[PDB]
Amino acid sequence: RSTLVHWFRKGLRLHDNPALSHIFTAANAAPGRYFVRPIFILDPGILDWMQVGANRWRFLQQTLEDLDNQLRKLNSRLFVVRGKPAEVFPRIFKSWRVEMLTFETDIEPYSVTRDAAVQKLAKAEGVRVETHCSHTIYNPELVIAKNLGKAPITYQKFLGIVEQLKVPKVLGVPEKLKNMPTPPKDEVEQKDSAAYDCPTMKQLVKRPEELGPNKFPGGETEALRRMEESLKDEIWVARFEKPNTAPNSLEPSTTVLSPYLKFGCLSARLFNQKLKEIIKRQPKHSQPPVSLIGQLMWREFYYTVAAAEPNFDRMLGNVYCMQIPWQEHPDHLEAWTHGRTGYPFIDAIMRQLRQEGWIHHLARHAVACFLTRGDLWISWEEGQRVFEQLLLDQDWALNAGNWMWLSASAFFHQYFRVYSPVAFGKKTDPQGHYIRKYVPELSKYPAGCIYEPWKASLVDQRAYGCVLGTDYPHRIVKHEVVHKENIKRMGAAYKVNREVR
DNA sequence: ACAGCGGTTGCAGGT
DNA sequence: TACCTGCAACCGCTG
Ligand SMILES: Cc1cc2nc3c(=O)[nH]c(=O)nc-3n(C[C@H](O)[C@H](O)[C@H](O)COP(=O)(O)OP(=O)(O)OC[C@H]3O[C@@H](n4cnc5c(N)ncnc54)[C@H](O)[C@@H]3O)c2cc1C
């Protein structure tokens, strides 16, 4: 009796998962030939390629738990195999007699190399491999192809291309498995019958002191529930313009579906379709680039360009990337990293980020601009690695692309527009409630200088119960000097990059 | 050929 | 209010 395997890596969902649905329609088509083994490989070869904070482990733990619950409703379960895909796949091809493997494709360099090996090792043992493209609405490979073998490097050019492509159908949830007993215990399940069960928090999070409030639980269920809440107000959705959403509202002012889209708990395609249904009922609506569909198209865009370039997360060797002489400065990196910059707005954001693992897009803008071209002149690659650790939604392509944007290394080139770490947040939080929350030491300062504590006299600071240099740090740089100064470094860097290009 | 246009989300100082 | 402006002038795309 041969086994059918779906491999979860992303696409952590039952709904709109063609790679998964094939296995289930295939098993039900000829029941009694097949066992079904939906697996997720807990890969230690991931921790040596990337950084993973506690908040995101909890998210993964919860997603895997929810994914297991849902598979059980389909008379199956999730099998969590510990091991590196190299050691794991040849063993399970053998002991399970794998007739077919399926998975959702990924453009990310680690997974491309991982996939090739498995694609090859599957052909070595005659296993059929059927991959699907469902993490994105459009296939980056086809987007590139229709643009004559090149990735379009502007948003509008990108839209023109994808409008010429038809959208795959959004699949529902797969068929409940019929007349299908549980698979026989392999060599590993015989030693330990719980070997492939869901990791507990204790097992997965080796670091529980670094967890913050569980504001965004993982899993398909919470993803679907949150989308429905996010789209309940159809007038809000129609008129949605990203630039008018607050970075410092205590409640998130956007959908916060990014972590769900990153793990594939929510299908980008389903989400796109729910929006398109709202568009019909609400013909007066925002367009790209600022609308919600437009935000999905940004995801698509960055995935396309990234797909074409394996050095996309890196300045050197990156076809898109401006070559800029960033400084090494450990003290300033360390201060930015732990929200100890002395600019309360920046510090507020980095602390929310660390504690909760999500921050608003424009909050990311503010801190990224500050780290790179705005103030500290530190490479975007560093900011990337921090975000990569702290973000629930860390996504290789998205993190890289947006970091290159904010440093004006690629895609964005108007480096004379520099965010003010003092001024930016005032429009949406003039009282500084956001700062009072994440920088509690300053929570008794008057609004007139909570963004600029260094304007308080010493006696003022004492009366506010927080002296600068002791209870909260002196600002590590003077924005009003360094941003003009950096603008001229950028002018200089661009001149050099032209004189090659 | 290269001036001119648009570019998801700047700031300060303006009506 | 939501769109003036000037800043010193960037990119890729277009015709
Ligand atoms: C320096 C920097 C790093 C970033 N790193 C990541 C990352 O690691 N992973 C990630 O998902 N987002 C990243 N973002 C992009 C963006 O900030 C988030 O996708 C967004 O804040 C998610 O919140 P939301 O779900 O409420 O987005 P919404 O405003 O509700 O938009 C809906 C969805 O569209 C997509 N989207 C929105 N904005 C962008 C964007 N600018 N680029 C690409 N896709 C977008 C997201 O999937 C998002 O969930 C980064 C932005 C910057 C400034």
Coordinates of C-alpha atoms (C1' of nucleotides) in Angstrom, one line a residue, chain A residues 243 289 295 361 417 420, chain B residues 7-12:
Chain A
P243 CA -0.8 56.4 3.5
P289 CA -0.9 51.6 -5.3
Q295 CA -1.0 46.1 -1.0
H361 CA 4.0 49.7 7.8
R417 CA 12.3 62.8 1.4
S420 CA 11.6 62.9 11.0
Chain B
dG7 C1' 6.7 57.9 -8.4
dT8 C1' 2.1 53.6 -2.5
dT9 C1' 3.1 56.9 2.4
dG10 C1' 8.6 64.1 3.8
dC11 C1' 9.2 68.3 6.1
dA12 C1' 8.6 72.9 7.1

